[PDB]
Amino acid sequence: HARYRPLSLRARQTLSEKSDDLQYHVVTQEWFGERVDSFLTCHYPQWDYETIKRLVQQGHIYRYRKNGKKKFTRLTDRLEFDELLVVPTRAFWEKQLAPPSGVLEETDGPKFKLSATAREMAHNMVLFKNEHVIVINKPHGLPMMPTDDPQEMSIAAMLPAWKFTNVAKPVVCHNLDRETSGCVVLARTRNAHRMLGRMFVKRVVPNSVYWSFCVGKPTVNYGRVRMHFDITRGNKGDIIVARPSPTKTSKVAIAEFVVNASALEFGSFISFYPLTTRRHQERIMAAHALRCPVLGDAKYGGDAAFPSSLSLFWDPENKGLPLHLHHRKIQLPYKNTAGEFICVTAPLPTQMEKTFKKLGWPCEVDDPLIP
RNA sequence: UAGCAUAAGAACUAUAUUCUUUGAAAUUAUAAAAGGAGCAGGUUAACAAGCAUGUGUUUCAUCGUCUCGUUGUAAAGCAGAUUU
Numbered sequence: 001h002a003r004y005r006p007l008s009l010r011a012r013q014t015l016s017e018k019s020d021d022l023q024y025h026v027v028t029q030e031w032f033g034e035r036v037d038s039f040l041t042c043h044y045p046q047w048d049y050e051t052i053k054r055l056v057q058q059g060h061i062y063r064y065r066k067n068g069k070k071k072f073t074r075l076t077d078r079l080e081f082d083e084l085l086v087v088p089t090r091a092f093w094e095k096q097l098a099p100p101s102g103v104l105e106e107t108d109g110p111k112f113k114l115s116a117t118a119r120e121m122a123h124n125m126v127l128f129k130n131e132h133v134i135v136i137n138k139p140h141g142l143p144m145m146p147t148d149d150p151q152e153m154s155i156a157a158m159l160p161a162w163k164f165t166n167v168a169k170p171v172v173c174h175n176l177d178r179e180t181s182g183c184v185v186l187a188r189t190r191n192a193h194r195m196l197g198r199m200f201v202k203r204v205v206p207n208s209v210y211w212s213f214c215v216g217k218p219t220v221n222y223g224r225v226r227m228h229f230d231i232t233r234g235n236k237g238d239i240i241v242a243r244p245s246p247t248k249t250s251k252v253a254i255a256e257f258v259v260n261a262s263a264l265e266f267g268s269f270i271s272f273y274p275l276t277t278r279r280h281q282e283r284i285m286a287a288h289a290l291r292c293p294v295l296g297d298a299k300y301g302g303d304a305a306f307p308s309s310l311s312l313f314w315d316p317e318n319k320g321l322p323l324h325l326h327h328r329k330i331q332l333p334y335k336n337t338a339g340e341f342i343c344v345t346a347p348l349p350t351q352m353e354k355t356f357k358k359l360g361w362p363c364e365v366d367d368p369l370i371p
Numbered sequence: 372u373a374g375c376a377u378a379a380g381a382a383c384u385a386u387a388u389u390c391u392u393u394g395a396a397a398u399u400a401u402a403a404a405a406g407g408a409g410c411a412g413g414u415u416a417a418c419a420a421g422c423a424u425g426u427g428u429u430u431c432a433u434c435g436u437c438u439c440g441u442u443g444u445a446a447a448g449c450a451g452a453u454u455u
Binding site for chain 1: 418421422434437438439440441443448450452
């Protein structure tokens with residue numbers, strides 16, 4: 001909810017101590033030795049153990065031992081005689097600036113019906129599935145989140161389709177562009193989502209690859225690309241200023257590009273291994289840092305991503321050419337029976353398969369750079 | 372402020388007494404100042420009851436979209452580097 005401001009540690013402590021919306025449960029003879037978690041579970045049936053643990057471990061719920069200081073306790077610590085246990089209230093969470101933990105609130109929303117054809121499409125889309133995670137081959141044209149036009153299809157909309165024998169639908173762990181296809185990961189459970197979210201933040205060891213067909217050939221076969229973006233809002237779209245040097249408000253974008261095989265100076269096949277997440281880092285780096293736009297990228301390589309070189313295969317005047325960028329070989333923490341991590345791949349889309357076949361290069365090949 | 376001068380034989384001498392006289396130093400000492408290399412820290416940054424010019428607005432992030440909007444989070448979150 002709104003009216004929640006970012007608070008430093010001192011500000012949070014000051015607000016917590018000043019607020020009068022606190023309930024003090026006395027520890028009597030009957031609840032002396034009872035554990036904190038059991039006491040809270042008994043006294044707050046409406047709350048969930050997740051909320052209990054979050055509050056206790058983040059300090060929103062504490063105890064006062066008459067010691068002149070508020071002790072912050074673990075869930076496994078025993079209580080004591082004639083001591084207070086301070087717990088906030090709905091008033092504490094709402095009528096002030098301190099935001100609550102993202103569980104205790106009772107927010108809810110409606111549902112949405114899906115057609116049998118859509119469910120079958122989702123089932124065919126699914127690639128890998130276990131008790132924790134799903135990896136699906138998101139197509140080219142479909143978007144991930146709802147578009148500026150509410151009446152449009154989306155992966156978020158289709159999410160309930162692959163709610164296999166689970167009460168709650170999975171949650172997307174990361175998002176792809178509306179023009180890029182390939183693997184996308186869904187966490188089945190909330191704990192799985194929290195654990196797997198640490199993969200998609202900025203990292204130094206690549207775990208996924210992007211196969212791209214780029215017009216032109218970079219001067220070097222393998223290398224690293226680093227660009228600092230200063231995304232800002234514009235009239236309708238957003239401006240993306242890219243610079244080589246850092247800046248206070250800029251965000252870095254790092255990738256490792258390997259030219260798997262280049263036909264000639266006209267076209268090339270590149271693999272991008274990103275160490276960072278930014279709006280359109282792969283496309284921007286291919287277009288500017290490498291000076292080799294993707295074969296279907298009109299947003300950056302306008303009139304240059306559609307070359308007359310491949311007039312025999314693709315019509316240069318057909319601006320609807322799908323982007324020749326494909327997410328592939330996402331590596332997951334979960335291992336297999338052989339002891340090695342699970343690397344889920346996605347088959348190349350129709351256009352990239354056609355281009356590879358026409359150039360004579362094989363399509364189904366294992367990328368050793370992502371073990 | 373009233374009281375305090377003066378006094379001649381017993382010979383090293385006894386914890387007892389607050390008296391001989393200061394009531395306002397009207398700062399600025401310390402020379403002055405600017406932006407490759409050296410040392411140190413941090414790299415799990417710094418800031419955050421915010422921001423913008425009384426008003427409008429959640430924070431940070433998941434590679435959305437052309438304003439709209441899904442999800443997580445309220446830190447287990449956010450700069451830059453992660454090489455031998």
